[PDB]
Design a protein around this ligand. Structure first.
Ligand SMILES: [Cl-]
Length: 66
């Protein structure tokens, strides 16, 4: 398995993608966190796909480095 120290977050709400760069998900999904683009958007992965999603839609479980 990937290490338990892999940055990740829990979706608190559904997010449906409205462009082809966004990573959609459903409430409760555990998203692999890969980057923070700005004060509003993360990048991450779920089920092998990658894309952007709102910081405000998730609960951090393991934070990216600061
Ligand atoms: Cl620290």
């Amino acid at each position: 398995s990937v290490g338990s120290d892999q940055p990740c977050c829990r979706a608190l709400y559904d997010f449906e993608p409205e462009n082809e760069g966004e990573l959609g998900f459903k409430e409760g999904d555990i998203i692999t966190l890969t980057n923070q683009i700005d004060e509003n958007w993360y990048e991450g992965m779920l089920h092998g796909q990658s894309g952007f999603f709102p910081i405000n839609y998730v609960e951090i479980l393991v934070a990216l480095p600061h």
